[PDB]
Design a protein around this motif. Structure first.
Motif, PDB file in Angstrom:
ATOM      1  N   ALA A  35       0.876  -1.187  -0.071  1.00  0.00           N
ATOM      2  CA  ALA A  35      -0.126   0.004   0.040  1.00  0.00           C
ATOM      3  C   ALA A  35       0.682   1.196  -0.045  1.00  0.00           C
ATOM      4  O   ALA A  35       0.613   2.142  -0.789  1.00  0.00           O
ATOM      5  CB  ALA A  35      -0.798   0.066   1.097  1.00  0.00           C
ATOM      6  N   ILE A  36       1.792   1.562   1.037  1.00  0.00           N
ATOM      7  CA  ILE A  36       2.563   2.470   1.027  1.00  0.00           C
ATOM      8  C   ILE A  36       3.638   2.542  -0.342  1.00  0.00           C
ATOM      9  O   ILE A  36       4.152   3.676  -0.520  1.00  0.00           O
ATOM     10  CB  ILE A  36       3.302   2.834   2.355  1.00  0.00           C
ATOM     11  CG1 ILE A  36       4.716   1.982   2.451  1.00  0.00           C
ATOM     12  CG2 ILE A  36       2.317   2.534   3.176  1.00  0.00           C
ATOM     13  CD1 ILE A  36       5.349   2.312   3.676  1.00  0.00           C
ATOM     14  N   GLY A  37       4.013   1.509  -0.881  1.00  0.00           N
ATOM     15  CA  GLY A  37       4.581   1.507  -2.045  1.00  0.00           C
ATOM     16  C   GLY A  37       3.821   2.051  -3.326  1.00  0.00           C
ATOM     17  O   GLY A  37       4.308   2.811  -4.128  1.00  0.00           O
ATOM     18  N   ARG A  38       2.413   1.856  -3.317  1.00  0.00           N
ATOM     19  CA  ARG A  38       1.517   2.419  -4.218  1.00  0.00           C
ATOM     20  C   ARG A  38       1.406   3.883  -3.785  1.00  0.00           C
ATOM     21  O   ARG A  38       1.488   4.801  -4.835  1.00  0.00           O
ATOM     22  CB  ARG A  38       0.201   1.881  -4.307  1.00  0.00           C
ATOM     23  CG  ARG A  38       0.226   0.627  -5.135  1.00  0.00           C
ATOM     24  CD  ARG A  38      -1.400   0.473  -5.458  1.00  0.00           C
ATOM     25  NE  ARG A  38      -1.671  -0.960  -5.828  1.00  0.00           N
ATOM     26  CZ  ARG A  38      -2.030  -1.903  -4.691  1.00  0.00           C
ATOM     27  NH1 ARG A  38      -2.142  -1.634  -3.399  1.00  0.00           N
ATOM     28  NH2 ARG A  38      -2.153  -3.163  -5.227  1.00  0.00           N
ATOM     29  N   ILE A  39       1.208   4.365  -2.570  1.00  0.00           N
ATOM     30  CA  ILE A  39       0.886   5.663  -2.232  1.00  0.00           C
ATOM     31  C   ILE A  39       2.180   6.610  -2.492  1.00  0.00           C
ATOM     32  O   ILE A  39       2.306   7.534  -3.060  1.00  0.00           O
ATOM     33  CB  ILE A  39       0.412   5.807  -0.899  1.00  0.00           C
ATOM     34  CG1 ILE A  39      -0.805   5.148  -0.760  1.00  0.00           C
ATOM     35  CG2 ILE A  39       0.076   7.553  -0.765  1.00  0.00           C
ATOM     36  CD1 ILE A  39      -1.294   4.998   0.828  1.00  0.00           C
ATOM     37  N   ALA A  40       3.468   6.216  -1.971  1.00  0.00           N
ATOM     38  CA  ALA A  40       4.568   6.997  -2.008  1.00  0.00           C
ATOM     39  C   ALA A  40       5.263   7.217  -3.141  1.00  0.00           C
ATOM     40  O   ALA A  40       5.557   7.940  -3.624  1.00  0.00           O
ATOM     41  CB  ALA A  40       5.539   6.271  -0.822  1.00  0.00           C
ATOM     42  N   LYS A  61       3.189  10.680  -4.308  1.00  0.00           N
ATOM     43  CA  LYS A  61       3.154  11.435  -3.282  1.00  0.00           C
ATOM     44  C   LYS A  61       3.286  12.900  -3.535  1.00  0.00           C
ATOM     45  O   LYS A  61       2.593  13.859  -3.366  1.00  0.00           O
ATOM     46  CB  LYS A  61       3.811  11.069  -2.031  1.00  0.00           C
ATOM     47  CG  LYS A  61       3.904  12.409  -0.861  1.00  0.00           C
ATOM     48  CD  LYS A  61       5.416  12.208  -0.160  1.00  0.00           C
ATOM     49  CE  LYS A  61       5.352  10.874   0.688  1.00  0.00           C
ATOM     50  NZ  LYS A  61       6.332  10.877   1.751  1.00  0.00           N
ATOM     51  N   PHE A  62       4.440  13.241  -4.390  1.00  0.00           N
ATOM     52  CA  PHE A  62       4.817  14.460  -4.670  1.00  0.00           C
ATOM     53  C   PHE A  62       3.770  15.265  -5.819  1.00  0.00           C
ATOM     54  O   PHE A  62       3.512  16.276  -5.627  1.00  0.00           O
ATOM     55  CB  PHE A  62       6.175  14.630  -5.209  1.00  0.00           C
ATOM     56  CG  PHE A  62       6.802  15.857  -5.454  1.00  0.00           C
ATOM     57  CD1 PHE A  62       6.524  17.047  -4.396  1.00  0.00           C
ATOM     58  CD2 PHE A  62       7.430  16.471  -6.467  1.00  0.00           C
ATOM     59  CE1 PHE A  62       6.841  18.250  -4.685  1.00  0.00           C
ATOM     60  CE2 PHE A  62       7.893  17.442  -6.613  1.00  0.00           C
ATOM     61  CZ  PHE A  62       7.738  18.727  -5.822  1.00  0.00           C
TER      62      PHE A  62
END
Length: 175
Positions: free
Chosen positions: A102-107, A114-115
Motif C-alpha cells: 500500500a505505501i509503495g503504491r501511495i509513496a 506523493k509529490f
RNA sequence: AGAGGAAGUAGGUCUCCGUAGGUGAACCUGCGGAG
C-alpha cells in the motif's frame, strides 16, 4: 491562565532543539525532550484561547512529521488544517499484505506519486507507514484523502492522478 | 542454339535506530529493522 503540555515522538528531537513561539504569540515555552514533553504557558501578554490552541496545534504538527516551512504556515493561516489518516482505516481485504504494497503504491519510487499528488491538490502530506498525515485546506484534504483511499482500493495511479487533476481544477474555479 | 508468324495475361517517500565500509566528531554509501 491555562497551560498545555504536549508529548513529542523521539524522531524530531534535534529539529525541536533547533530554534521563538514566545516572540510569535507572546506565550512562554519550556521543553524537555528526555521526558518527551513541551510546556506551553499563557502569560499576561497571552490574550486568547485561539493563540493557545493554535500554538498547541503548531507544535503537535511539527512533532508529527512536518518541518517549520510547513509549520509556520499553520502558525500564520487560520484556514489550514491537519488530518491524520491511518492506513488501517477502511480496509478492502482482510489480508496482511497491506503495509509494504500500500505505501509503495501511495509513496512511489523517489516520491513521485506523493509529490505529484501534493502538487496536484495543493496539500502537503507526509508518510510514515501506518499513519499518513495531510496538511492544507479541508477540501484539499478531502481530495488527497479520496485519492489515497482510491490508491489503496487498488486503482492505478495514472487514472487516480488524472481524476485528481480534473477535480482540483474544478475546485479551483469560482463559477 | 534463331530472326519471324500467331496468341494470352498485367512502484517504499520521509525520519530514526542497529550494522559494514569510506576520510576522520559529524558526514556519505550499502543493507536489516521499526515508525
Amino acid at each position: 491562565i491555562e497551560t498545555r503540555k504536549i508529548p513529542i515522538p523521539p524522531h524530531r528531537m534535534s529539529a525541536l532543539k533547533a530554534n521563538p513561539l514566545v516572540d510569535h504569540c507572546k506565550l512562554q515555552v519550556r521543553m524537555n525532550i528526555k521526558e518527551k514533553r513541551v510546556e506551553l504557558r499563557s502569560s499576561k501578554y497571552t490574550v486568547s484561547n485561539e493563540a493557545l490552541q493554535m500554538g498547541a496545534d503548531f507544535v503537535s504538527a511539527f512533532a508529527m512529521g512536518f518541518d517549520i516551512d510547513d509549520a509556520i504556515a499553520l502558525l500564520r493561516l487560520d484556514s489550514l488544517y491537519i488530518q491524520s489518516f491511518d492506513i488501517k482505516d477502511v480496509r478492502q481485504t482482510l489480508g496482511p499484505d497491506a503495509l509494504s504494497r500500500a505505501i509503495g503504491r501511495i509513496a512511489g519510487k523517489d516520491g513521485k506519486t506523493k509529490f505529484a499528488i501534493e502538487n496536484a491538490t495543493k496539500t502537503r502530506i507526509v508518510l510514515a507507514g501506518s499513519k499518513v498525515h495531510i496538511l492544507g485546506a479541508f477540501e484539499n484534504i478531502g481530495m488527497a484523502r479520496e485519492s489515497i483511499v482510491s490508491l489503496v482500493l487498488g486503482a492505478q495511479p495514472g487514472k487516480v492522478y488524472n481524476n485528481l487533476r480534473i477535480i482540483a481544477s474544478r475546485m479551483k474555479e469560482r463559477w
